[model samples]
Target: SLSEANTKFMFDLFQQFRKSKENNIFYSPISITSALGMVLLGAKDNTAQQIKKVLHFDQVTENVHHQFQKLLTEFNKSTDAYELKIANKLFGEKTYLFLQEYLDAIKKFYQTSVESVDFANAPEESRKKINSWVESQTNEKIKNLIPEGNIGSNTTLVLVNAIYFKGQWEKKFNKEDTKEEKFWPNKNTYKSIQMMRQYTSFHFASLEDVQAKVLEIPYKGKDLSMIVLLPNEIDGLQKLEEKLTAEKLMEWTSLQNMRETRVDLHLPRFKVEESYDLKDTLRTMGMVDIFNGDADLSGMTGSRGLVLSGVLHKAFVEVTEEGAEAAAATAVVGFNEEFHCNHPFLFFIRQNKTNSILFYGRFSSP
Candidate 1:
């Protein structure tokens, strides 16, 4: 239940983010949760409460730690046709002292360990090591999560998460069907990109209130899928996004809303690489204390020795006739469905069973 709450908050964050800056966007909220959840294991007092409420962990019980293990285990279990890899780790200054029980809890629930690093002296080397770890876990799709000049000698701890996913559709789209097409993000901004087409049946719906059509494209093994929310008008995305919610997205995907209707599918074949520095965004979400000077992060250490220095997130996605490849990283940071993704629309990569919103973003341009 709390897990789904996280998804809801994640959608809320995405909507807020889209409003703040209009552009191509991508992110994995679950990755942010994983990294921060590990930190929550050591968190106590108000620090824990702030993260819990902001991330929608307040309704969660103490059993959540154990529940996360099972969720990650189930999600990571994949077949030959697909791969979903998720991992979290903690890197702290080698000289910093951490409670053994805290470290043990992270290892127990998150399968993570504290790796010693020299943040106070050799911050560059530490950053490189963390970036390399991210690259390795994400199939090299997400590189340089922590950019240069972000980390310094005063840095104490860095929590990182990486999730990589690649899946072939149960019903494949032939490469021959792809054609060049026009993309219109706004009235004056139109660009040409590769549009992939196909003739097939899929779970589909058209919402009148939002003026959007929702389509479901299932991945191999049926455990995960991509849902598209396409508005009838090219500029209807703004309106749809205005009314969008995790609950509404679920409503669009509801069995009652979606019918097993067959329709010709036209999707664009493009890649999106987007990144954000989320320190300000998190503060706007009522997660204020973690980044400020008065913050208390005593859970990680015996004293309040750590404040969230920065929150950096980067995500990449590509959809081809065959399938999709996506990887994302959220440094304590963290859309929609459619029947036809023609024009600007919102899309999300979701886990079918748990209804986890893994990647929520939009394709506005090539």
Candidate 2:
């Protein structure tokens, strides 16, 4: 049940994020955990245990670290079908001497590359170099992920985790069918945006108790899909969000709970990019000792010299008519409905094979 625990951690992280800023929200729980896992490889004593406890790593078997290596391989099984990538790096100060064990862990497990930067002497230049590496990993979809001054002279290392994904819809929206439509950012506010329209038969379910509807739009090969959780009312997302949890997600995603039905889908074309330092969120989540000068990380260096400086994550998603990316059935006549994402809603890009969630967020505004 480690996967279940990890899934819980994913939504738990997202729910914590929801309590924060209310603007457009987006993040890759996969990337966040993968990034932290890299750090965990070298943490010792309370530092290691705190992260392990919060991430539910202790609840899993000893082979958990080895499991990550397997997941990394499965996540990128094919590059031609779509682009789903997770990259890591340790940009350390050129003068600092890190143990070979730490460097080897990055390479053997994360498959990461190492580059030395003079953070103390040329912090700005070092920042740009790190940013450039991230840009290349994401096909430039995400840029300037680490803002100015986030990296400084006192910093010894910046452990980087960059996750990127681009998938083609199995049944693409016709470019000629897209049009500007009304979108309610809230119950009262409205804005115009390009909405992609389609009429197809796809897996969908209605949650009467939650006052919500669930829809799944698949990518080519059907190995991955975008699942949307829409509140029935124009302003019902907040209420629905409060009830969201990892188990609740499983309830909605369970195949027995949903089935293919006729649906005329309306989804707005949106491009969103969000960045977070994650120090506040992760600290508040009970792994409090990583950031400050009160911890031990001797596994990376025989001496307790390193403290986590920052945990940065950036995510980007664009849903449009031309994907770079469905109908009714007579036997299923009793289960038919229209899927419209005109108001605020939750969405996640997930893999069908492992049910791993690559990205999770909400789009509420134009």
Candidate 3:
């Protein structure tokens, strides 16, 4: 019963958050929550409870309490520094022992330049190496976040989730071309900020209530792409709020037939960092009964009192030649020449094969 309710609530919250942004907004809460959910799905009730408490998902609407503001402040502070703070917040003192041995092995493999290593049945040494490699691969911005002494012998496993994203006007914007533009801070006044402009090929669509566009750009290897969604009206985010859901997201993305259109793109570079204990939020989302000490997680292990310890997530985004990289360690790139994105928008990155959401979030001026 709680799961059913919480799922609905989460979907609604995500929808609202998405709908509120016009230019761009990055949201990694879903991925982080889902990933941690997978991990907690296996944890003892006590651990699970702690995780829930730490994340503050144990209650709903608490998200409105300075969390979003904190994210924006952190983003305005420094892109790289904010990520490190988030990493530390999530990992805490336990991180070093949690990631140490694994990183050591990874360093060895990297030095040796092995062609391929199977992580499925790796020995302890190999496992350590593989983990380190994974950490390096994910946390590209922050060096040595996964240290040698971080992981301990008693540590059973470590889960590291990283998301990186960059997006650019389908047509590149010249720095000289940028000029101050008016953006709505709320309903009344406007904030003047420099906006980048360009022309290029883009994916465009118009719903009855809102207008949507997809801007794509290629990374170095062409294996990744960034997709951005821009709403038509100034506060059209509200319309999007009415439209977000797992099914709705699938539908919106499915509409992108890869068709091309000529257009203009104007956007300002903005970034944010947010950290929270998601336990209460998760509980409010309908996962209530599960966090209790008496809850059942027999599927994870035989241990008791294994509630979640906490849920932590951080995101970094920039408009660049490559598509969008999200919280997950995935990126997207490539687009036809004529496509251009010129409006407030939303974006995400996914694995080409599985369509698994590597990272997803939104950004906007307001």
Candidate 4:
């Protein structure tokens, strides 16, 4: 149920980012969802319902908090090939009193606790503390999560989630094989890049529906794979993305629709780090009341003076010859093919067994 909710939420959020004029977009949907799950625990009335709608949790039948705990516990299972961690922590004003019951519930359900900080007097210090905690949780890749002046004396609580993934390719790419090559950001514009090349058998599919090709490159543990959606034409990603839907994405990436095929892959060795202040984004997505006076987070405390100030998220990713540190889909397979990601494309890292999309991005810029 959480997986389904996450899929729908991911696509919905993607559409918002697509409308922006930004050239490249990347973020951890699961992290954002999990962070909001913390907030949802304290929400009540129409405020809770609106958050539920934004997260697509309205469609879920089970308790969302319990599901988050279960999924996070599952992620802790041992694996040798990769390191994956998701963390959620709440920083509240030291002067304000958070209900003990809510704190205990957060610990019980999300496996994390709220920490009291001096937000009223030392907002800058509190911001740094929050940023440090996030950076440590994400292997220092996600730094300065809460930028200066973002958290103020009026801030009552801040909920932050950090997700870090470091994975080795099942068939590692040779460092010597990486070569400088041209990457086309558009139909006519190009830039030089260090292209990582490898020849291996991968799950591949060519989707005539979207005019794109899909390739699955597994991590060393084989429980996870990076799904790359590359458009056939030099600039087909826009149309492909326009036509994309939750159902179409599920169909395009289903394993049954894909097949094992030999692939000559040419992927760029690139790294992406992104930071977002999601107050406007979430507000635009219909999570309105929580940011203003109408919020009824009486569940967090006994009264309703408290309002969410900011929902800050930062993500980092690095791809290289040895492995990927930081960090999704489908089609049918036929024969040997050349899967060259020389143009702008979309990608996501997925947990194979659970079909949960961990990180999603569009590699459209240098």
Candidate 5:
């Protein structure tokens, strides 16, 4: 019951976050939600609940709550405490093993990297080795999501790594139609950049007083898909942001009735990578007490006075051939991007089954 409830809670949390477009704000909610779900499967109750609450699902629907509880009960039988502990300890020896099992269960819907270390119990050599491994895995995109110096002998450092991607327009874009187009960066500023163009049958609809288009791009196995939301007004992103509540987003996505319509799609191929030190961001999002070191995570060995020392998240997104190859690799990249997205666009990646969101975020370029 507890596990199911936890799972539902996580789903709802993800749904809400997905709508809000937190982080890069242009990812698949299903992929992100599923990734978090898988990560929570390996997390202790205290950590998981803290994560859910911070994501703001404390007020979600009852069905979500009930379903999560049911799913968690099933998950418990499938996992063991030793395995969970092994996951908690960032001992490089088990990295591939843990990831293999995770991948097998969630399939291609998710990818993860986690590192844990018992700072106090490990030898100096072991600690160094662990740190080196973390850096290498992230391509130095993240240095120490864990940080150096004293981790306190009693504290154990746990890092969860994840990168989920889903891309591929079901109908491939016409290469001939793609051309350099003039893009208005602002009201008066315009620049010509290579724009990928597509004219194909897709879900076509319009919002009240706005033009809206929906496109679905399926992955190779059809297990995953990317949904793109384009507002009719060139600067519709502003209104979309204001209307981007969880309820409204769900409503907008559900209202689509797939139909045949020609679409003139122009999207810039952009690459972005971001690192976030989630300590403050999580706290700002309502995860305050846990990081204070006065939190109770007894579910994790009845440990008290334990606070989250740090949370690092890194994400990279590229509109690629397959679809949208967006990888959220979190090892600790503090939020410091100068890009301002204030236009109307929506992006998401989701698992076909279970309707779990693996990754969903949005970007507005006004």
Candidate 6:
């Protein structure tokens, strides 16, 4: 149910991001959702209600934090085939009194704790401490997550979430086979980049109505996979995006609708690093009260002055012959179909069993 709720929120947020004028888009839906789960812990009344609705938690039947705990614990389990580190931390003004229950709940559910930092006294030092903690947690893939002037004496709290995952491909691509090739950003533009080529059997499907193809490239453990949705025409991505929705994604990507086929795949060796100041974005998504002084986060400290000022998220993803590092995702049968990602496309990395999308993005430019 949490997975379903997550899927719904993923698509909902994508609709907002699609309106952006930026050529490239990338973000971790699960990372942002889980971090907000930390905030939702202390939120009360309408503050909590708005977050639940924006995250589609109202669509989930069970207690939302309980579900997050289960999912976090699942990700925390140590494995030999991959490295998945999901780190959440809260930095609070040292003088402010925070309830032990809130700290304990965050530790229990999110597996992290709040650090007492003197934001009022040493704002720059506090920001550096938080940033370095994030850097270490993500193996330095994420840097300077909170920029200058974001945290100051007036700021009382900051919630940070970083997710890093590195896993080898189930079918590795030869580095020698990677050659510079033409990639189309749109119908009128083309750029040359290194494209990794491979001929292998993968789960694939053809979306005839959308004029696109879906392919699943699994990691070594097989617990996770990257699903690529490449449009048939150079300018076909916009139309496919217009028709995209959670229901359609589910129906289109279900394994039952796809078949393992021998595919001639060409994926680009691309890296995307994206940052967002999500206060207005979340507000636009109907998370209104928390950003204002009228917020009631009394559940956190038995008071009403605590308001969420900023929600910052940064995600990095690199696809190479060895595997994918940092954070953050189709099909058809028998014949040797060509699945070339030489143009703009939609991709998401998902957990196989839970079917939860970890990262979702669009790579249009180089």
* Predicted structure with the largest lDDT when compared to the true one: 6
Summarize candidate 6's per-residue lDDT along 1-366 as a digit string, tens digits: 888889889888888887778788888898888888888888899999999999989888836788888888767544677887677777788888878889899899888667888878888898888888888877887888888857767777877777778888989999999999999887887899999999999999999999999999999989889999999998899899989889899988888899999998999999998877777888999988888876878777877778776777788899999888765200000006999998999998888887888889999999
lDDT of each: 0.80, 0.77, 0.42, 0.81, 0.45, 0.83
- lDDT (10s digit) by residue, model 2, range 1-366: 566667777877877777756577887777777777777888887888888877778887656768877777777655566767667777788898878988888788877787888888898998888878877777777777777757778777777777777778889899899898999987888999888999999999999999999998888888888899999999898888889888889889766789989898998888877766677777888776677776677777777867765666677788876553200000000004888899998988887878787778888887
Q: Which stretches of candidate 5 lie over 4 Å from their true place?
A: 1-52, 55-155, 209-211, 255-258, 331-344, 364-366
Query: What does each candidate score in C-alpha RMSD?
Result: 3.1, 7.7, 12.8, 6.0, 9.1, 6.0
Q: Name the top TM-score candidate.
A: 6
Query: Model 3, range 63-101, lDDT digits (tens) per residue?
Result: 321332233223211232122112211221222222233
**Deviation in Å, model 4, residue 292 alpha carbon:** 0.8
Lowest lDDT sum, 10 consecutive residues, model 6, at 326-335
Candidate order, lDDT descending = 6, 4, 1, 2, 5, 3
Q: What does the lDDT read for residue 281 in candidate 6?
A: 81
TM-score of 5: 0.64
Error of 5 at 154 (Å): 6.9
Query: What root-mean-square deviation over C-alphas does model 1 reach?
Result: 3.1
| Residue 335, model 4: Cα distance from true site in angstroms | 58
Clashes of each: 8, 4, 97, 5, 58, 11
Better of 1 and 6 by lDDT: 6
Clash list (residue pairs), candidate 1: 213-339, 215-338, 228-337, 228-338, 229-337, 229-338, 230-338, 335-360
TM-score quality measure for candidate 4:
0.95
